[PDB]
Design a protein around this ligand. Sequence first.
Ligand SMILES: C[Se@@+](CC[C@H](N)C(=O)O)C[C@H]1O[C@@H](n2cnc3c(N)ncnc32)[C@H](O)[C@@H]1O
Ligand code: SF4
Length: 340
Amino acid sequence: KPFVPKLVYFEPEALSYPLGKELYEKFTQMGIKIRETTSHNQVRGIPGETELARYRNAKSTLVVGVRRTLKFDSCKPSAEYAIPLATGCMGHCHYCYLQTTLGSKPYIRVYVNLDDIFAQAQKYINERAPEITRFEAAATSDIVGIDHLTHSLKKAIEFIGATDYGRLRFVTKYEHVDHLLDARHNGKTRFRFSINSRYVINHFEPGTSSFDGRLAAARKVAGAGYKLGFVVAPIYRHEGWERGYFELFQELARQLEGMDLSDLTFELIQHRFTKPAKRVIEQRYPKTRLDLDETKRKYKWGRYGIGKYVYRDEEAKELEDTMRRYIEQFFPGAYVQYFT
Ligand SMILES: C[Se@@+](CC[C@H](N)C(=O)O)C[C@H]1O[C@@H](n2cnc3c(N)ncnc32)[C@H](O)[C@@H]1O
Ligand code: SF4
């Protein structure tokens, strides 16, 4: 049930680092097919005759490379920066925004040069101290879902835990958190889970852990002293969404009752999609119920890239107000960090 790749690519340079060496040893011992690639951003020969086949097979492919981009991207409103530990995901969420993100790849990538990466993170922290600098580790991947293979996130958690002015956060749809429970987080990591209505999870989130699985994991990480949070996203106006999301927060409260929820956080993100979304999603998920009708949406223009469709202002406000009402009803004193 925890993710294991069926095909693994290595950059030759990756073997020079401890994680690369360790993964090569692990995967050869398991007898898994291993290939070489010059760059992790140009992987050749992933099997499949159709686009759909190559896409599905890429989602079962792990690529082990070196992070050569010095700059960390900003990650507002979640955090100051995205810390780059991995890219890609084994999940098959129909709506996933990563599908149409510039330069995104369908395969799962992990970076081995953690010394370089954490040193750069410390540099950003130093540049802003004594202000707090937050790092998002799950901006372009499900870092938690991959981590049982690498422990890169566990190392990041403990790196940030040792800093004075650094904070870490990440969000997951996976329950495989056991190895992270004894990590020395030192109160400086916010462990979040993506949750949604029964409609959205059942119809649009195949290849992820169940709602009960995500909540079991949430109880574990809270019990281990992590700061707990939830990301309600994508907020999607399906038939009967009002009651659907009411029952989400009601069930969420029942599954967390007894626990201290004085520092619990919520983040709210409405469903958004880009212009190329329809063609990409229809090819990859032919039977999807996902509504990508742009005529009923408002378009936000891009800045340096292309923009995105979101719900019209009045629909978005309706969503925000309704979610805020439910959170106030079932989780008094929980902080809503933002709606976007
Ligand atoms: C990019 Se997701 C990476 C982290 C992890 N693998 C996870 O799924 O939680 C980050 C969040 O953004 C949501 N999200 C994904 N696509 C969309 C979208 N199109 N519109 C609106 N929201 C979208 C997902 O449900 C997540 O809550
Ligand atoms: S899990 Fe997070 S990342 Fe993996 S697919 Fe579903 S959304 Fe995209």
